[PDB]
Amino acid sequence: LPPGWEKAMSRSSGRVYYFNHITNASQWERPSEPARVRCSHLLVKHSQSRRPSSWRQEKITRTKEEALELINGYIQKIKSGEEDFESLASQFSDCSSAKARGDLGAFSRGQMQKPFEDASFALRTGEMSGPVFTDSGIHIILRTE
Numbered sequence: 001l002p003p004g005w006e007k008a009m010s011r012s013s014g015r016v017y018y019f020n021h022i023t024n025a026s027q028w029e030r031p032s033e034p035a036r037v038r039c040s041h042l043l044v045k046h047s048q049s050r051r052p053s054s055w056r057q058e059k060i061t062r063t064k065e066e067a068l069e070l071i072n073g074y075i076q077k078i079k080s081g082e083e084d085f086e087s088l089a090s091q092f093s094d095c096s097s098a099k100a101r102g103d104l105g106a107f108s109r110g111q112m113q114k115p116f117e118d119a120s121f122a123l124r125t126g127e128m129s130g131p132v133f134t135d136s137g138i139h140i141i142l143r144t145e
Protein backbone atom coordinates (compact mmCIF):
# COMPACT_ATOMS: atom_id res chain seq x y z
CA LEU A 1 0.00 0.00 0.00
CA PRO A 2 1.36 3.62 -0.39
CA PRO A 3 3.17 5.63 2.42
CA GLY A 4 1.12 5.86 5.66
CA TRP A 5 -1.58 3.30 4.68
CA GLU A 6 -2.56 0.38 6.92
CA LYS A 7 -5.24 -2.41 6.67
CA ALA A 8 -7.59 -2.56 9.65
CA MET A 9 -10.76 -4.26 10.77
CA SER A 10 -13.89 -2.22 11.26
CA ARG A 11 -15.47 -2.75 14.67
CA SER A 12 -19.13 -2.23 13.68
CA SER A 13 -19.24 -4.37 10.54
CA GLY A 14 -16.18 -6.58 10.75
CA ARG A 15 -15.33 -5.35 7.24
CA VAL A 16 -11.68 -4.62 6.28
CA TYR A 17 -10.97 -0.87 5.78
CA TYR A 18 -7.88 1.22 5.21
CA PHE A 19 -6.44 4.02 7.25
CA ASN A 20 -3.52 6.33 6.88
CA HIS A 21 -1.51 7.15 9.98
CA ILE A 22 0.15 10.20 8.45
CA THR A 23 -3.04 11.88 6.99
CA ASN A 24 -5.66 10.33 9.29
CA ALA A 25 -7.66 9.49 6.13
CA SER A 26 -9.90 6.39 6.32
CA GLN A 27 -11.88 4.68 3.57
CA TRP A 28 -13.41 1.25 2.72
CA GLU A 29 -11.71 1.04 -0.65
CA ARG A 30 -8.11 -0.09 -1.12
CA PRO A 31 -5.93 3.00 -1.98
CA SER A 32 -4.20 3.20 -5.49
CA GLU A 33 6.72 11.50 -3.79
CA PRO A 34 6.41 14.91 -5.76
CA ALA A 35 8.76 17.97 -5.26
CA ARG A 36 5.85 20.40 -4.86
CA VAL A 37 2.16 19.92 -3.91
CA ARG A 38 -0.70 22.39 -3.88
CA CYS A 39 -3.22 22.15 -0.96
CA SER A 40 -6.20 23.92 0.50
CA HIS A 41 -7.30 23.43 4.06
CA LEU A 42 -9.90 24.25 6.65
CA LEU A 43 -8.49 25.14 10.12
CA VAL A 44 -10.46 25.01 13.30
CA LYS A 45 -8.50 26.72 16.12
CA HIS A 46 -8.99 26.10 19.82
CA SER A 47 -7.95 27.67 23.15
CA GLN A 48 -4.47 26.03 22.97
CA SER A 49 -3.66 27.09 19.41
CA ARG A 50 -0.40 29.16 19.13
CA ARG A 51 -2.61 32.11 18.15
CA PRO A 52 -6.15 31.75 19.64
CA SER A 53 -7.63 34.43 17.40
CA SER A 54 -8.87 34.64 13.81
CA TRP A 55 -10.78 36.77 11.29
CA ARG A 56 -13.97 34.94 12.45
CA GLN A 57 -13.57 35.37 16.18
CA GLU A 58 -11.31 37.69 18.14
CA LYS A 59 -10.81 35.42 21.14
CA ILE A 60 -11.13 31.78 20.30
CA THR A 61 -12.22 29.88 23.42
CA ARG A 62 -13.44 26.42 22.19
CA THR A 63 -11.69 23.41 23.64
CA LYS A 64 -9.48 21.10 21.56
CA GLU A 65 -12.22 18.47 21.98
CA GLU A 66 -14.92 20.89 20.66
CA ALA A 67 -12.69 21.89 17.70
CA LEU A 68 -12.29 18.14 16.89
CA GLU A 69 -16.03 17.74 16.96
CA LEU A 70 -16.47 20.62 14.52
CA ILE A 71 -13.82 19.17 12.27
CA ASN A 72 -15.56 15.75 12.35
CA GLY A 73 -18.96 17.37 11.42
CA TYR A 74 -17.27 19.13 8.43
CA ILE A 75 -15.58 15.92 7.21
CA GLN A 76 -19.00 14.20 7.41
CA LYS A 77 -20.69 16.83 5.29
CA ILE A 78 -17.93 16.94 2.77
CA LYS A 79 -17.90 13.13 2.45
CA SER A 80 -21.73 12.80 2.26
CA GLY A 81 -21.65 15.48 -0.58
CA GLU A 82 -23.88 17.63 1.54
CA GLU A 83 -21.45 20.57 1.39
CA ASP A 84 -18.34 21.03 -0.56
CA PHE A 85 -14.89 21.56 0.96
CA GLU A 86 -14.51 25.09 -0.52
CA SER A 87 -17.75 26.29 0.77
CA LEU A 88 -16.98 25.12 4.36
CA ALA A 89 -13.49 26.48 4.17
CA SER A 90 -14.74 29.92 3.10
CA GLN A 91 -17.28 30.05 5.87
CA PHE A 92 -15.58 28.34 8.74
CA SER A 93 -11.80 28.12 8.41
CA ASP A 94 -9.92 30.07 11.16
CA CYS A 95 -7.16 30.63 8.70
CA SER A 96 -7.20 33.81 6.57
CA SER A 97 -6.84 31.49 3.51
CA ALA A 98 -10.65 31.03 3.99
CA LYS A 99 -10.88 34.04 1.67
CA ALA A 100 -9.32 32.00 -1.10
CA ARG A 101 -11.58 28.94 -0.40
CA GLY A 102 -8.75 27.59 1.75
CA ASP A 103 -6.14 27.51 -0.99
CA LEU A 104 -2.54 27.82 0.21
CA GLY A 105 -0.89 27.67 -3.23
CA ALA A 106 1.95 25.27 -4.03
CA PHE A 107 4.77 24.50 -1.58
CA SER A 108 7.73 22.18 -1.25
CA ARG A 109 9.08 20.33 1.83
CA GLY A 110 10.73 22.62 4.34
CA GLN A 111 7.98 25.37 4.36
CA MET A 112 5.00 24.24 6.53
CA GLN A 113 4.64 22.80 10.06
CA LYS A 114 5.83 19.18 9.85
CA PRO A 115 2.50 17.38 10.55
CA PHE A 116 0.79 19.59 7.91
CA GLU A 117 3.58 19.02 5.43
CA ASP A 118 3.78 15.29 6.00
CA ALA A 119 0.03 14.90 5.55
CA SER A 120 0.13 17.10 2.43
CA PHE A 121 2.82 15.09 0.78
CA ALA A 122 1.25 11.74 1.69
CA LEU A 123 -2.09 12.68 0.03
CA ARG A 124 -2.67 11.82 -3.58
CA THR A 125 -3.92 14.58 -5.93
CA GLY A 126 -7.66 15.00 -5.19
CA GLU A 127 -7.50 13.34 -1.77
CA MET A 128 -8.55 14.77 1.51
CA SER A 129 -6.97 14.12 4.94
CA GLY A 130 -8.69 13.40 8.21
CA PRO A 131 -8.09 15.67 11.25
CA VAL A 132 -4.44 16.81 11.24
CA PHE A 133 -3.21 18.44 14.46
CA THR A 134 -0.55 21.20 14.41
CA ASP A 135 0.21 24.02 16.87
CA SER A 136 -2.21 26.19 14.86
CA GLY A 137 -5.10 23.89 15.54
CA ILE A 138 -6.91 21.05 13.73
CA HIS A 139 -6.99 20.95 9.90
CA ILE A 140 -8.75 19.12 7.04
CA ILE A 141 -6.33 19.18 4.11
CA LEU A 142 -7.26 18.74 0.43
CA ARG A 143 -4.42 18.12 -2.07
CA THR A 144 -5.47 19.81 -5.26
CA GLU A 145 -2.18 19.38 -7.28
Ligand SMILES: Cc1occc1C(=O)N[C@H](Cc1nc2ccccc2[nH]1)C(=O)O
Binding pocket: 043, 051, 094, 095, 096, 097, 104, 112, 113, 116, 134, 136
Ligand atom coordinates in the same frame (compact mmCIF):
# COMPACT_ATOMS: atom_id res chain seq x y z
C1 LIG B 1 -1.29 34.50 7.37
C2 LIG B 1 -1.63 33.34 6.43
O1 LIG B 1 -1.93 33.43 5.11
C3 LIG B 1 -2.16 32.14 4.68
C4 LIG B 1 -2.01 31.29 5.71
C5 LIG B 1 -1.68 32.00 6.78
C6 LIG B 1 -1.41 31.44 8.18
O2 LIG B 1 -0.32 30.94 8.46
N1 LIG B 1 -2.43 31.53 9.03
C7 LIG B 1 -2.34 31.04 10.41
C8 LIG B 1 -3.12 29.73 10.54
C9 LIG B 1 -2.39 28.58 9.85
N2 LIG B 1 -1.56 27.72 10.44
C10 LIG B 1 -1.12 26.87 9.52
C11 LIG B 1 -0.25 25.79 9.58
C12 LIG B 1 0.03 25.06 8.43
C13 LIG B 1 -0.55 25.42 7.22
C14 LIG B 1 -1.42 26.50 7.16
C15 LIG B 1 -1.70 27.23 8.32
N3 LIG B 1 -2.47 28.28 8.55
C16 LIG B 1 -2.92 32.08 11.37
O3 LIG B 1 -3.72 32.92 10.96
O4 LIG B 1 -2.59 32.09 12.55
